[PDB]
Design a protein around this ligand. Structure first.
Ligand code: LY5
Ligand code: LY5
Ligand code: NH4
Lengths: 251, 256
């Protein structure tokens, strides 16, 4: 066959390949997820056709409870697999299958090096260093929904003053950390990408939660089990580690 | 008459433990722990009766030099159990011979060490020799380091295996004692570290997770129970029951 793979542009998982002339088909894209897709293809033996998700969304439910994004593409059988940094959540797991995670991670703190701040507790107990998250992002939502005291206090601070401590998107957030006295709460995968490329920034403290990214399949897929096993094989052989360093290691 | 599933499991604190008693107990009443509570919760979602049987050889399941399997894995292969409800790590080699549900716990390897020091990562340990570090001999964490191709873990394994493997320890209890009495860091599964740090207020988990992995319910290959178990684990997640059960069995005396 040719499997249709839904995916989404997200640096450095899936990016348009630099070119001086128009590119076509799978040659338009490169990145960690394209390399993962290639390894999966080699192990399981399938051909594939990468299609960016038309609405540019990962997948969530609206007020009606209808799904969108890559999740919807799988539900509607317009895609055979989603190979993207798609977070495994029980709400999605109800409607699609997920492989074993190919990346495990958690929320953490991006800030400057050389300071006395060593945890979320240290941020929460003060107000001089501003801190926040990308508005309407996965991490902001974690804080908004937390029932843990420290994280409730943090959300109160973040959501205070008309949410001035929140940012529009990740690049704005990263530049806010660089230019001002500000700490950004974000997924640790994104933090490591930034700290690899900005020597004066660091992850502060450990991970505040745990989550993982998995390959999405429609429920009933003949590829479900085989994908999990292939990811286990790639982890054991050190290949996931190699592909991560390929795309994350920076200047 | 009725279908009672046979469930293989293994004594391992606080997953499966003999219940305290002033008289002999029999049957399922002999046992308590996180996995007994998980099994009860699953049985009330899927609808089944069950009979817990400790794996006779006391092993999780590995292959000998001839490729033959033992432990809970072999009980499943031979259809002497319907389910293995235990902290059975989902691994590549086991996936070739049994099936697993989605994980009911996710975890990794981490570092058990004293509080109040500047050590923050495996890389901090690997780049020095003053603080000794190691793992339980022949355990899953030691096996990870011994097989690792990753640079810093290769360096750590060379330290651990140097000097007649003096940096390794015999079992978890000696490992924990060695961290408490000497300048020693123990590499251990994170679920075991969490159990220890709840009970020893001067110890901490250092750094994040290595070798991410999950524990799943094992079934024989092809079993129709496997997907039903997955569906049930999702429901227990949505109900907050997995978190509740973790708190119940991991909580200690508190630390001031
Ligand atoms: O499946 C999902 O919803 C997410 C979306 C996407 C989320 C980003 C991280 N967020 C993007 C963001 F810019 F919104 C801020 C950041 C965060 O909330 O931590 C990392 C890569 C993806 C991981 N899976
Ligand atoms: O499936 C398996 O082989 C393992 C066995 C068993 C392994 C223990 C962890 N080990 C016990 C130990 F504490 F002695 C050392 C530790 C480790 O390897 O890091 C945790 C509970 C189980 C998780 N699944
Ligand atoms: N399997």
């Amino acid at each position: 066959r040719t499997l249709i793979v839904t995916t989404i542009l997200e640096e450095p998982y899936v990016m348009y390949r630099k070119s001086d002339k128009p590119l076509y088909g799978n040659d338009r894209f490169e990145g960690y997820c394209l390399d993962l897709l290639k390894e999966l293809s080699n192990i399981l033996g399938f051909l594939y056709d990468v299609k960016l998700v038309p609405d540019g969304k990962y997948g969530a439910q609206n007020d009606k409870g209808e799904w969108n994004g890559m999740v919807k593409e799988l539900i509607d059988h317009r895609a055979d697999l989603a190979v993207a940094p798609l977070t495994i959540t029980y709400v999605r797991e109800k409607v699609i299958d997920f492989s074993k995670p190919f990346m495990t991670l958690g929320i953490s703190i991006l800030y400057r090096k050389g300071t006395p701040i060593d945890s979320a507790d240290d941020l929460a107990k003060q107000t001089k260093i501003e801190y926040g998250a990308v508005r309407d992002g996965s991490t902001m939502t974690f804080f908004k929904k937390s029932k843990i005291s420290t994280y409730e206090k943090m959300w109160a601070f973040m959501s205070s003053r008309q949410q001035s401590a929140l940012v529009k998107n990740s690049d704005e957030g990263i530049q806010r950390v660089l230019t001002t006295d500000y700490a950004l709460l974000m997924e640790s995968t994104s933090i490591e990408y930034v700290t690899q490329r900005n020597c004066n920034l660091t992850q502060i403290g450990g991970l505040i939660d745990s989550k993982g990214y998995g390959v999405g399949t429609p429920i009933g897929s003949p590829y479900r089990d085989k994908i999990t096993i292939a990811i286990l094989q790639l982890q054991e052989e050190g290949k996931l580690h190699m592909m991560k360093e390929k795309w994350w290691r920076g200047n």
